[PDB]
Amino acid sequence: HMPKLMLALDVLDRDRALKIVEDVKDYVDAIKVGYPLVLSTGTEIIKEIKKLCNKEVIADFKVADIPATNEKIAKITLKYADGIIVHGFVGEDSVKAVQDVAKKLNKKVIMVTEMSHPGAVQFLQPIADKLSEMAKKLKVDAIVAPSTRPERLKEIKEIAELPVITPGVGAQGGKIEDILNILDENDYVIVGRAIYQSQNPKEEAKKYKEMLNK
Amino acid sequence: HMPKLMLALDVLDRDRALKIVEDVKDYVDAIKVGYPLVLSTGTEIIKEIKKLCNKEVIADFKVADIPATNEKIAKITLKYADGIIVHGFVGEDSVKAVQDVAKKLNKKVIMVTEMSHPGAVQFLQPIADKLSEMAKKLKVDAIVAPSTRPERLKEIKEIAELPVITPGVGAQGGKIEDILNILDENDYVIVGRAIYQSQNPKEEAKKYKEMLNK
Ligand SMILES: O=c1cc(O)n([C@@H]2O[C@H](COP(=O)(O)O)[C@@H](O)[C@H]2O)c(=O)[nH]1
Ligand SMILES: O=c1cc(O)n([C@@H]2O[C@H](COP(=O)(O)O)[C@@H](O)[C@H]2O)c(=O)[nH]1
DSSP states (O other): OOOEEEEEEOOSOHHHHHHHHHHHTTTOSEEEEEHHHHHHHOTHHHHHHHHHHOSEEEEEEEEOSOHHHHHHHHHHHTTTOSEEEEESTTOHHHHHHHHHHHHHHTOEEEEEOSOSSTTHHHHHHHHHHHHHHHHHHHTOSEEEOOTTOHHHHHHHHHHHTSOEEEOOBSTTSBOGGGTGGGOOTTOEEEEOHHHHTSSOHHHHHHHHHHHTOO | OOOEEEEEEOOSOHHHHHHHHHHHTTTOSEEEEEHHHHHHHOTHHHHHHHHHHOSEEEEEEEEOSOHHHHHHHHHHHTTTOSEEEEESTTOHHHHHHHHHHHHHHTOEEEEEOSOSSTTHHHHHHHHHHHHHHHHHHHTOSEEEOOTTOHHHHHHHHHHHTSOEEEOOBSTTSBOHHHHGGGOOTTOEEEEOHHHHTSSOHHHHHHHHHHHTOO
């Protein structure tokens, strides 16, 4: 009944990736696999990860193209993954193209709203409330909203009325204690580098999991 | 001294992809390879295509993440590809992270401005002039701007003062005659489905190449 922990597995080597998954599996609740890993290893890594930890695996592919292309990417991705992350800024039709594929396969679609890095302020932040409204309109499964700006995370979550997965804790300077009050059992805190760059990923994953006790 | 032709190779099979490339190589000036093909075949298809047609190969990966992740994606992609397409909407720092990688490797970075599909009007269009100003500021190699809206294509090109690659002709309803007067020899017209879904891609590539005679 606490917020959950999602590992952002952005390593570049299959062996290192599988090793980290094995090490952290008792403490992580889902694995987020992105293009840094997938372009290095191929989509086959997704099924391998899943068989190793028996947890949900989300493909963070930041899908951001026209509907026809989004549909192709979604079909390939969701053969292997349990869900897929899509950008909202490219427009409603592009999001729906991914949703249509995910609905037929019973898979999750997660939409990016405001992002966590400084550049997000330039274009994403001024329309992030409207992205949040769109996520609510489209009934996506969850949204991505930023740990680095707790006030915005709260605001975005309350507009969307959807579960969040939230990145920014650790390497990007976000701190668990500053967002813990905002999150519930249906949310995930995303942690990448703070876990995968450590000499003892098991211990760090355990530390982060226990930090989510609220 | 005419606008050039860039094939959008969004097929899902390696055999079909290589066959199309072989058939159209005398008429196309560059090949754009995206995630539909790469997630299906792996990044290795990029070197294969390059050896097959001896043309520039651009990875249309719509790079749209935080700087650290963008950097990882760029490094992997540009081992193989001659250039990479990045979104501007994620912010200046994210674009620069890709540029920094490409500068070291002497590769091209192409930034998306306004997109060609209806959904682009929702969030991209209202800030596309600012994206164009940012592309100029950042001195990227080219921008993507839409064939489907000739007046916007003209406006965007004149703000950026950069070469464009422009999609939308054919499947999306754009017509060469409507943009030809806007383009010069440093620009590329992107054509995908109208060429790759035809029973005779060679003939269609020829037709499209001849249509660029201006
Ligand atoms: O706004 C966002 C959206 C993301 O998906 N991410 C992703 O979340 C992860 C964060 O990892 P890290 O803890 O190493 O900063 C990365 O995979 C990154 O691409 C992010 O950092 N900010
Ligand atoms: O605004 C844009 C930007 C793109 O990269 N594209 C890409 O250009 C290509 C267009 O192909 P087609 O001619 O089959 O519509 C696709 O690969 C698509 O993802 C686009 O259509 N519109």
